């Protein structure tokens, strides 16, 4: 049964969420990491503006950040999936399918299970509340690397799994199997983490260079 | 600690 | 609310699961490797005990046990730990601590983890009907790698699912909170998996050499 | 195929 607190809750968090395009190989890669950084930028936005987050240590901010960045930039991906065409849009105007992204030099490795992810997440059919409750989630893990406080951490999480089920209750009153459908995505999310840490390795093999905030996340 | 290796993040949550 | 088809497959599985210890490292290494393999022995012994399994292809089954058997192995682990003495006991007589460990030459960035998820897990207390149902679910991931059937896995998986959560509403009927936290620790045991991958990995540069059923499993 | 590459894991399945 969704309480108030709750409704309240979800709704201020869907809230807070509301280079040109053509080495030339080298020119998609510029665009598309300086998409990522538009991303990264409104993930920690958005973490800021989350119940319980500002009050954790600042070094258990970096520590959650460090790690879900990838996770919650999936989801987001995911969420601007078009499965007509089979493409991506980035800020509302920039749509890409896999060949896009092959031109830019990332791995088929890389690419697929993106891909097939995005393809499965379509298939749930989530709102902007219950993935703004899942990137919440994401966010709260109390097993990332670096963590202090994972009694607080794992504390707020709950609160925002009891919100997402009981807010699925109302959405999808006459299937349960929602809910769990949703949080087992996180599963599958912790898989495609390793997936771009194997990105990462091999851009640096190639001599491919990051920009400074995404190799302050990911770079070794 | 991990804030002293992460700057702009830093920054970014201080603004 | 438990159906009585619910109750019988769950008691079925409950059912199903009812060298020596002194290079002297590498004889505790052999010791431990001879356990794993006792361990990936049960593990297949149950996964045909599964409603649905042996009705997949061969080569489904086998692209399901290759990735779920280091997770169910983390998982029975976990069983096995005794948080007084902070050991883990195999074959219910061969009982072992951190240090043990470090011994037979495995890395501490595999040791650690594995501890911390044993005591998280702990913390739990999940009986045999849980463990059961969660390797299940484990066992029936249809993101796994080489998946064909991904259908019906995944509705394999759901079925399981739904048992677990009916289930531990009557273990636990004053706690809606302990049917996702029992999901949650499958997103830790992905993590795990890729820890895991790092050891095996770090075994060949040293030239320590996995037994063959383990080889074939886990080595690259 | 996974089966071809796995037959210790497939005589175990068999069995
Ligand atoms: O649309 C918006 O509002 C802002 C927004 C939201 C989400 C993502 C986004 O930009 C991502 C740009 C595409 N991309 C960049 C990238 C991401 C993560 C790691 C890397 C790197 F390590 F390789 F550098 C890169 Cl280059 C890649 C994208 C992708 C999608 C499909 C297939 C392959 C790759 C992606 C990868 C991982 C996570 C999210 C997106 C802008
Ligand atoms: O007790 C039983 O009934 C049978 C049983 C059940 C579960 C496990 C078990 O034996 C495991 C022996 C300990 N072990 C071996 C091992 C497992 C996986 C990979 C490797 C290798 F790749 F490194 F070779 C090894 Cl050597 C290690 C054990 C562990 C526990 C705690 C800290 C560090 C290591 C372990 C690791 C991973 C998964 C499960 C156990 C017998």
């Known amino acids: 049964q969704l309480s108030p607190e709750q409704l309240g809750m979800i709704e201020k968090l869907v809230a807070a969420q509301q280079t040109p395009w053509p080495e030339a190989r080298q020119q998609r890669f510029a665009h598309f990491t300086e998409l990522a950084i538009v991303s990264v930028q409104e993930i920690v936005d958005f973490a800021k503006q989350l119940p319980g987050f500002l009050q954790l240590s600042r070094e258990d901010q970096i520590a959650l950040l460090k790690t879900s960045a990838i996770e919650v930039m999936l989801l987001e991906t995911s969420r601007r999936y078009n499965p007509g065409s089979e493409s991506i849009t980035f800020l509302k105007d920039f749509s890409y399918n896999r060949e896009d992204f092959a031109k830019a030099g990332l791995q088929v490795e890389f690419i697929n299970p993106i891909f097939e992810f995005s393809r499965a997440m379509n298939e749930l059919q989530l709102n902007d509340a219950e993935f703004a409750l899942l990137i919440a989630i994401s966010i709260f893990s109390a097993d990332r690397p670096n963590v202090q406080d994972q009694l607080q951490v794992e504390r707020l999480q709950h609160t925002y799994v009891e919100a997402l089920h009981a807010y699925v209750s109302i959405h999808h009153p006459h299937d349960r199997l929602m809910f769990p459908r949703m949080l087992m995505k996180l599963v599958s999310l912790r898989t495609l983490s390793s997936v771009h840490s194997e990105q990462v390795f091999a851009l640096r093999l190639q001599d491919k260079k990051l920009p400074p905030l995404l190799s302050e996340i990911w770079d070794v | ?15």
């Open chain 2, 1 to 15: 600690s991990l804030t002293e290796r992460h700057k702009i993040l830093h920054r970014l949550l201080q603004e």
